[PDB]
Ligand binder design. Sequence first.
Ligand SMILES: OC[C@H]1O[C@H](O[C@H]2[C@H](O)[C@@H](O)[C@@H](O)O[C@@H]2CO)[C@H](O)[C@@H](O)[C@@H]1O
Lengths: 222, 358, 214
Amino acid sequence: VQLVESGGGLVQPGGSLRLSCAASGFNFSSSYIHWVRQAPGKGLEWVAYISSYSGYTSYADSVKGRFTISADTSKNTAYLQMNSLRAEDTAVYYCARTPWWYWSGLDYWGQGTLVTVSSASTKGPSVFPLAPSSKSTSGGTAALGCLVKDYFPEPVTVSWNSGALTSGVHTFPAVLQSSGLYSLSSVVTVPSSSLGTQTYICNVNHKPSNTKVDKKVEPKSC
Amino acid sequence: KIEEGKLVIWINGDKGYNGLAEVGKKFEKDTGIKVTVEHPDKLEEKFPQVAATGDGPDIIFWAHDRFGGYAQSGLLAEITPDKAFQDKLYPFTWDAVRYNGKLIAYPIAVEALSLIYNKDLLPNPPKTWEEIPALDKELKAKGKSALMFNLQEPYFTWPLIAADGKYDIKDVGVDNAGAKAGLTFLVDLIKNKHMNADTDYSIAEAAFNKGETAMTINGPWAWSNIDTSKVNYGVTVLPTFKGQPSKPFVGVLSAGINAASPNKELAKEFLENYLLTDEGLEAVNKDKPLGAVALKSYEEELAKDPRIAATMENAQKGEIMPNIPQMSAFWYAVRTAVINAASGRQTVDEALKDAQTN
Amino acid sequence: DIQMTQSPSSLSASVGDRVTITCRASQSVSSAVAWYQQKPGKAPKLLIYSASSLYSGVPSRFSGSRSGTDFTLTISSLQPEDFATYYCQQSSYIPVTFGQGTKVEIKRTVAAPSVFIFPPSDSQLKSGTASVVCLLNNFYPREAKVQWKVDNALQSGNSQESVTEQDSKDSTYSLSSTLTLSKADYEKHKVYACEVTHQGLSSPVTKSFNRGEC
Ligand SMILES: OC[C@H]1O[C@H](O[C@H]2[C@H](O)[C@@H](O)[C@@H](O)O[C@@H]2CO)[C@H](O)[C@@H](O)[C@@H]1O
């Protein structure tokens, strides 16, 4: 069972995007497809639904006249065509379904796709090491990291040693700088005695710019 | 021709036609307008015959699946409930009665088949279809049988046929291997003398209500004759087949207005302001239960009855009926296939191939 | 349009506590109310439908109930993994509407942060900017206060911070703070310091480096 969204991403304001939701593993022809959106740090907002059974569609007041919901039962795919896009429409967009029967909830949900509405250009991050202190405590724990600075739009992913190091990892939420570019940090704590002897590499991916960087993090030399 | 200044209503003989008549009497006691409720035989085949030349009742009740064919032939008036009336029903129920984007009937209630069982013969009903032969052998040794249900109407056999899982029957999708598996199981129940190919609605009802069979398969309308019978009964989830839930085709009992009726405004008043109210539906429901009613205010009450919770459980596992104009052909092809396989006139494979052809 | 109001908007409760979130419908919806749990970064997951039906597979510590127009989600015994935002939703009317969400965090004993400062890398300065980073690792409660000092002068307006979601096993937070300056401004000063104030610390802790020292 799955709902797979596609088609999101950076769009200019006043512009347009078509979101797809490809379904499988349930009866699409008698389900209702809903689009529910979530703006950064805010709650869920239901925007539109369509009955596969009858073709009936309806809309939240906030999107009426700009968004069109549709569905092609023959490819089990539903759509949300978004026109005259605004800053207020920036959100992760989820497709979700309900079955035919009126007492159900939204049982199946898509992974969400991020729609960003702004004029800014796509920019890959720079990646700098946060190097472990030369004063790291003997027989103690050390911290190290990478700072993933000045990218747009979200998101960025960070792994350590290609996914093999997960324990003690914290990747922080990005903050939006006054420049309009995001910055984030990811850190991990390791034993101090392993700084001479183990390798720690941060693996940063920014899909929107097709940036992938691997950065070895080590104590600074004098 | 249809008489002006009165209402004629057709509803099926298994539904609460006396209770509906009482709603007719309230209508008349306060408008002067006489309401006649009839339940003719094969009403669902007569209505398109008589309506085509402008005859028939002003209002017809049936499950929604036949309404598409009627709307396509121009036999149904588009109904005009205002946005506020529509908000009195669960929003999804309106979809069962939309045809080409137009509203062509009022939804009344969601009906799904359940397993009904005699708690004194069978305190723990079987979880699976497969175990029914062994249960029947046990019960036969005491002069009883495990299960009797109407084998003449494909509505009652569909949940089994549909359970497991180009091979369309009249443009309805069917899992070929799954329909073969279900229908073979049903043919084997008959060959092995656990059920009889000739059992129909009356025979199965009389056997259950007389305590001769431990289980039947029926809808909510059936419960009031069981209440009268004093059988200590329960309503429960249908058995599974090949580990999968039985999947009934679910009908929404709906009320359409004849396109040729000179009483469209009166019918609308009767439906919106007399029937689709707590008082109206309660009248029909005390005669024969409706199932899960579309009217939010009244369904809110009924939904605590465990019989209705069972009805809802079986509905969640089944599939709303399509309302494509082919549905009448679809049911007839299934009916023919089940009867010919069950009697042994044809094999399962031959019967299913015939249903899938043209 | 129907408004669904959840109370409270936020709550803190210990593992093993019984938790109640209530939702009041703007006009009368019928038992047509579902509850969802949403982890941050993720799709909401259905918990309860038709007000009191437990969705298949959901742990039986979750239950739903109704009293007139008040809907109640109960977690009978709160688990460290239950931190999330919970949402009620009505489907008696179109437009479908969601409550505003109730944020549940796990209450636990006080835990002090461990503090780390990082100077800007050489590669960064090489481009015109200097970001200095202060890490507070694994603390509770969430309210930690970071104060940057540059040659002992208080800083204001030139730093930003963010906090992780609560850890699923030990229920702690971590916090990162970035002080951002021009390479030119960074080079006018010697001592860079981050001072951390928090319930678990009996007095503020300061980590610092001297620019260009090792
Ligand atoms: O058997 C095919 C028949 O099935 C359904 O009819 C049901 C009806 O929905 C119930 O209300 C109750 O009357 O039993 C009937 C089964 O005898 C379809 O709705 C009908 O069109 C179809 O012919």
